[PDB]
Amino acid sequence: SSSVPSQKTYQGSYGFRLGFLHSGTAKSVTCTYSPALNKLFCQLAKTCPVQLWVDSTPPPGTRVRAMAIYKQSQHMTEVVRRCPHHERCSDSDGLAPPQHLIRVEGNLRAEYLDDRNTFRHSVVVPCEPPEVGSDCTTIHYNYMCYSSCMGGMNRRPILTIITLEDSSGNLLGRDSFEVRVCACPGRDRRTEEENLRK
Numbered sequence: 001s002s003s004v005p006s007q008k009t010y011q012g013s014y015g016f017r018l019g020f021l022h023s024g025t026a027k028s029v030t031c032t033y034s035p036a037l038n039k040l041f042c043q044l045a046k047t048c049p050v051q052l053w054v055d056s057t058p059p060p061g062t063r064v065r066a067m068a069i070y071k072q073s074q075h076m077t078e079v080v081r082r083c084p085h086h087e088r089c090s091d092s093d094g095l096a097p098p099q100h101l102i103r104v105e106g107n108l109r110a111e112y113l114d115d116r117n118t119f120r121h122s123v124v125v126p127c128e129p130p131e132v133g134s135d136c137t138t139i140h141y142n143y144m145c146y147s148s149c150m151g152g153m154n155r156r157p158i159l160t161i162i163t164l165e166d167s168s169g170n171l172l173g174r175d176s177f178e179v180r181v182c183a184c185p186g187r188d189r190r191t192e193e194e195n196l197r198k
């Protein structure tokens with residue numbers, strides 16, 4: 001078992017926080033975010049856009065890191081990893097180790113860390129300013145196991161912790177959201193929001 005990174009929201013000096021698109025809950029949806037649950041629902045290995053919002057521009061060399069932890073207290077010391085099936089299915093893009101649950105899509109500067117002390121996985125990219133005509137920068141994540149994968153997440157809820165870091169890895173900001181990776185994200189978001197309203 002491993003030490004548990006903080007999940008405490010921390011806007012920091014740059015006013016760092018996440019944002020999510022409004023994709024709705026139709027059958028064709030592959031990634032959908034519930035503000036009422038603070039929970040992203042997505043399909044396996046599909047694009048998950050996450051917005052990075054800041055009040056002021058952080059220095060060049062600022063990076064942004066994603067890491068998964070188990071939400072429940074009896075599981076939070078366990079490293080989140082891909083299940084024994086998906087870690088062996090040879091689907092690495094050449095950067096992501098096959099054990100890593102979270103990948104970054106479409107960024108050749110993504111770096112993947114296996115922490116030498118905690119053995120936790122994370123993926124980190126340079127934080128870049130918004131493009132022209134945009135108010136935020138967007139990262140595309142992929143989740144490479146289902147929440148239900150036996151021997152992996154095994155139906156246990158996870159959180160993704162997003163940290164803004166300086167070039168040394170020191171904390172500048174932190175935010176987080178729950179994730180369910182499932183075949184029917186729109187149907188599952190509708191169900192869980194309906195459960196919350198009852």
Ligand SMILES: *c1nc(F)c(C#N)cc1F
Binds near residue numbers: 054056058128130
């Ligand atoms: C990461 N890096 C940046 F440079 C900005 C700006 N501006 C935002 C961010 F999330």
Ligand SMILES: [Zn+2]
Binds near residue numbers: 082083144152
């Ligand atoms: Zn799996």
